[PDB]
A paper describes a structure:
Molybdenum insertases (Mo-insertases) catalyze the final step of molybdenum cofactor (Moco) biosynthesis, an evolutionary old and highly conserved multi-step pathway. In the following synthesis steps, MPT is adenylated yielding MPT-AMP that is subsequently used as substrate for enzyme catalyzed molybdate insertion. Molybdate insertion and MPT-AMP hydrolysis are catalyzed by the Mo-insertase E-domain. The molybdate insertion reaction involves both functional domains of Mo-insertases, namely E- and G-domain whose role for the Mo-insertion reaction has been studied in detail using the plant (Arabidopsis thaliana) Mo-insertase Cnx1 as model enzyme.
We found that the conservative substitution of Cnx1E residue Asp274 by Glu (D274E) leads to an arrest of MPT-AMP hydrolysis and hence to the accumulation of MPT-AMP. We further showed that the MPT-AMP accumulation goes in hand with the accumulation of molybdate. To shed light on the molecular function of Cnx1E residue Asp274 with respect to magnesium ion coordination, we proceeded to solve the structure of the Cnx1E D274E variant. The overall structure of Cnx1E variant D274E resembles the Cnx1E wild-type structure published recently. As a notable difference, no interpretable electron density is visible in the variant structure for the region comprising amino acids 269 through 274. However, the active site magnesium ion was found to be in place. The disordered region 269 to 274 was confirmed to be highly dynamic in D274E through ensemble refinement. In the wild-type structure, residue Asp274 interacts with the octahedral water shell of the catalytically relevant magnesium ion and is therefore involved in its coordination. Replacement of Asp274 with glutamate seems to prevent this interaction and to give way to reorientation and disorder of that region. In Cnx1E wild-type, this active site loop partially covers the putative MPT-AMP binding site.
Author numbering:
A (entry chain A), B (entry chain A): 16 to 83, 96 to 129, 135 to 268, 275 to 307, 314 to 441
Write the structure that this text describes.
């Protein structure tokens, strides 16, 4: 048995960033940039008016002028975002003007040079680096790529993940009345969804029975298909099959929930494939995915910060620590204007009983409280470290 | 001009949750549940062994027994997750047993009733409500649906969003050398990406010129196509066209960045379509999308908490407040073990110059600092409210 910290260090040391690809602008969304992006022209590329009004020679000052290149004694109409004609050095917004006669315009104020003008390149200078390698592409970065005219982008791809379930007792989730000794396969749909939330392509390999030849054939098809990660759950015939096909780095971790977790590296007949022999118990299966698979997906996708967000929060109820195993205690956290100590902060409620077979303990859990192995009851209002496992922007108030 | 709070209250009052639909299990991921889900059978549906070992009569105690319904004086082999035979009331893990002879088994310990057995329904009782209406579906909820055998789910759908850009000066982002008075359309790709991040289908309506008949025809095609939301940017011919087609609730908001923002409700020739006439300036366009469109998408998708996560954080540098307009100041926030006051907390750095034309001010911005209109310089180490605008689980450490 190895601590979680060593198991992560081993996974980070074995895991390698995927080779970069060129994708279309909308396929680049969510991906990490594999090249720097430079503006080929300035923004704005011409002096642009900030307002609807008249382009003037600021020195002329208040007066009546004909509307027409702008020379002293003349003005020209401009619109927001339109170019300033040559010779004009300032814009007088339409509110500070009046049309005279049944074209002549009366400028009502004394303006200053460069007023209501965006000079060439004041938002983005030509050849300036607008985005760098290692930067994740969100909506604003798509806007910067579009501004710079980059519609084909070099990025790190997401890994392709194969997923299978193991068990003679499993039936498909479409099963109605269950026969003797049968349960619905819940890990596969759960892991397919968890991987879809990580924006990875999934290869669903179905239910495999507790049969060595059958599992070997499915693992071989997975390796041969070109996937980067294989997730199995249960049966940890899995560990011995992964030892035969490649290198197993660990098979047991000091943690609650669970204990078994096999991590292996296989060489395709060639690229390497990472394999996680996840525990069968639904809770341990999803907790191991959150702690060990998520940072691996991120690392393969070129994330420079693959680790999950860790915060400090206050317990809303007392929680019993385990005397030997450090726990990943499921919780529903929220930001409060008063966290219980007077100042604002995160607070956590337990999801109830934490048995590894109890999938209801994962229901609505947006964090994993890291409880050290002291054996003591942590009182309500005491502080703990917590790993955030679901979109912090989608957090309920 | 109306404050942002009133503009939001108006949008929340006009916006209506979409009619529910039935979708497949993987299409349900990310959606809000429109029905309660009940377990049709218990979990486990049979008494299940927690270990590999022997199902025994606990009262028999240590001794040698033949392996075979279990009666006193006999034992039966069981595997993890397999059913307990009738008559056995406890499981003795294989480590506390030994096979005797060249089948007979020696039970080495005195066990207690129900040891290493998951009784019928101990994880989920039959007919128990595992998920409720209004609950968002993540990976664990997909696992609970799969456990309960629900592969067709009643949910609230995401709205379909139409998007267009306006401007005689715009060219496609594929444009290489720009002609006089031309800029690349950056708002449309940015808004398509922002809406894709909200998991909504997009109808890309392209660039529309500053021509009343042309914009009317495109708005009519958008309304006729069945979309729930229309996003336009720039030209705010937009407001007068939205007044003619439906009801405009506001056209100007007291805020920095920007000022113009038209919100309208149109009736299709019938369902209602919400229209946001977003400001043309890239920054104002994305800030208005983050503040006003995101909670609208959520409300239409049946979210009971559509508001964004608001936290309290400390400034890493001084920031000048505006004397009249409350600002949505872009920042890069991170959780620190010491926020500057001794205890752990969020900290924020400004993205630099906040001009509405400067899209670089949105680059990597994961929060909007809510700066009240005091006109004073907020010193470094002082606290402010901040709206989190990007996945808190994807926050860089
Ligand atoms: N796909 C699955 N869905 C639900 N439960 C599972 C799945 N695979 C294994 N389990 C259960 O988790 C426990 C551990 O399984 P294993 O690691 O195969 O011994 C047993 O109670 C299994 O019935
Ligand atoms: N699609 C767009 N992409 C980039 N900039 C835009 C877009 N639409 C409008 N703008 C600019 O934003 C400012 C306001 O435009 P408008 O609201 O049309 O007056 C002007 O400087 C426009 O050039
Ligand atoms: Mg099994
Ligand atoms: Mg315009």
């Amino acid at each position: 048995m190895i601590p979680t910290e060593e198991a992560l260090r081993i996974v980070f040391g074995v895991s390698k960033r995927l080779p970069p690809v060129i994708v279309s602008l909308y396929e680049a969304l969510g991906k990490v940039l594999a090249e720097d992006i430079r503006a080929p022209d300035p923004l704005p590329p011409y002096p642009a008016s900030v307002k609807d009004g008249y382009a003037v020679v600021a020195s002329d000052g208040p007066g009546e002028y004909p509307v027409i290149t702008v020379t002293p004694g003349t003005v020209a109409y401009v619109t927001t975002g339109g170019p300033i004609p040559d010779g004009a050095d300032a814009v007088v917004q339409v509110e500070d003007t009046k049309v005279i006669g049944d074209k002549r315009v009366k400028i009502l104020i004394q303006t200053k040079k460069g007023t209501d003008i965006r000079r060439v390149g004041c938002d983005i200078e030509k050849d300036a680096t607008v985005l760098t390698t290692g930067e994740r592409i969100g909506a604003s970065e798509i806007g910067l790529l579009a501004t710079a005219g980059v519609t084909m982008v070099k990025v790190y791809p997401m890994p392709i993940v194969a997923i299978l379930s193991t068990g003679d007792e499993l039936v498909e989730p479409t099963a109605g009345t269950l026969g003797r000794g049968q349960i619905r396969d819940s890990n596969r749909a759960m892991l397919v969804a968890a991987v879809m939330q990580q924006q990875c392509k999934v290869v669903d390999l179905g239910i495999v029975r507790d049969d060595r030849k059958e599992l070997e054939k499915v693992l071989d098809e997975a390796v041969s298909s070109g996937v980067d990660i294989i997730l199995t759950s249960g049966g940890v015939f899995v560990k011995p099959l992964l030892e035969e096909k490649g290198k197993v780095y660990f098979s047991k971790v000091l943690m609650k929930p669970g204990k078994p977790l096999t991590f292996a590296e296989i060489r395709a007949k060639g690229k390497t494939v990472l394999a996680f022999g996840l525990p069968g118990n639904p809770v341990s299966c999803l907790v191991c995915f959150n702690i060990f698979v998520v940072p691996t997906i991120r690392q393969l996708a070129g994330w420079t910060s693959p680790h999950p967000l860790r915060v400090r929060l206050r317990l809303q109820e007392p929680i019993k620590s385990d005397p030997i195993r450090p726990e990943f205690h499921r919780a529903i956290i929220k930001w409060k204007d008063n966290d219980g100590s007077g100042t604002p902060g995160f607070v956590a409620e337990s999801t109830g009983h934490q048995m590894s077979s109890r999938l209801l303990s994962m229901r609505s859990a947006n964090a994993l409280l890291e409880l050290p192995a002291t054996g003591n009851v942590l009182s309500a209002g005491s502080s703990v470290s917590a790993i955030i496992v679901s979109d912090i922007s989608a957090f309920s108030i």
